[PDB]
From Swiss-Prot:
<keyword id="KW-0418">Kinase</keyword>
<dbReference type="GO" id="GO:0016887">
    <property type="term" value="F:ATP hydrolysis activity"/>
</dbReference>
<dbReference type="GO" id="GO:0016301">
    <property type="term" value="F:kinase activity"/>
</dbReference>
<dbReference type="GO" id="GO:0005737">
    <property type="term" value="C:cytoplasm"/>
</dbReference>
<comment type="function">
    <text>ATP-dependent kinase that could be involved in endoplasmic reticulum membrane assembly.</text>
</comment>
<feature type="binding site">
    <location>
        <begin position="30"/>
        <end position="38"/>
    </location>
    <ligand>
        <name>ATP</name>
    </ligand>
</feature>
<protein>
    <recommendedName>
        <fullName>ATP-dependent kinase YFH7</fullName>
        <ecNumber>2.7.1.-</ecNumber>
    </recommendedName>
</protein>
<keyword id="KW-0808">Transferase</keyword>
<comment type="similarity">
    <text>Belongs to the YFH7 family.</text>
</comment>
<keyword id="KW-0547">Nucleotide-binding</keyword>
<dbReference type="GO" id="GO:0005524">
    <property type="term" value="F:ATP binding"/>
</dbReference>
<keyword id="KW-0067">ATP-binding</keyword>
<dbReference type="InterPro" id="IPR027417">
    <property type="entry name" value="P-loop_NTPase"/>
</dbReference>
Amino acid sequence: VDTHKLADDVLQLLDNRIEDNYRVCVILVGSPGSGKSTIAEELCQIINEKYHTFLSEHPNVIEVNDRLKPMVNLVDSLKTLQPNKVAEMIENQGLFKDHVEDVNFQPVKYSAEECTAVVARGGTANAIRIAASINIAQIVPMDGFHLSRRCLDLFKDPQTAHKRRGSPSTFDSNNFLQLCKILAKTSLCKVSSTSSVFEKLSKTFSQTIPDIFVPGFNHALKDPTPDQYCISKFTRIVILEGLYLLYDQENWKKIYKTLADTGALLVYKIDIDYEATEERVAKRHLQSGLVTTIAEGREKFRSNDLLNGRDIDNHLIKVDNIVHIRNDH
């Protein structure tokens, strides 16, 4: 795939929506070993580099508006987890024992300078945090929303929960959807002769947009970790990458519509070279210790539809705006 061309398409949408959307979202889906992580980082970088180069010759172009307007309230629609329940949750290792598999459990907020935490069925481990050199593009990995291993222990059937970790049901889909709702709201708010997209965005940064912190995934501790990615008023391009952003089930299905409805969404789906991906994933499992030989790794890939991508392709939401891209090496 041509990442510079993706960068060009992203800037074109942003420019076209400059007056209607504070930020454009990009959805990038790929099965394990598809390389969505590197494509997203590369795209993100390219865009930021372009902006820095623009700033080089337009040194003082940046201005933050809406200084006399109130902050965009992102959590007003959520129920507040009363102080007593916050304590109970914290006491139970930051978990909600009776809702770990409840996809309909609604996210709740509470005050943790001040700072608002939004949690759902995964508890504190997948919390989104909202606050009271200049990069305009940021990535949002879905990995940070993996339910914690301790959360998986509370599943009615922990054994399968762990063995199948990485399946759609082992992520806090509730809170990821909530993150998307927050992003859409920060996009649909109300914005504000040149033709330069960078010039336009530089004069329209808004003081009303708070910093938003999202969890990341610590591959060493095999669990999610807090505030690894910050989306601020300067972030005008959000690149969400993951396995189930286009999955037609439960909360995942609502993701596309939630971001699509902003009118500022680009969607990409990576089509994998089977053999190359099989080898890649087989080697990863070997290096991680999951298998003793590459042959075992390959068979695991072939028989696990969560690994070979079949599950994702079978559950790909039916929308005509999904741009299929290749990442062959």
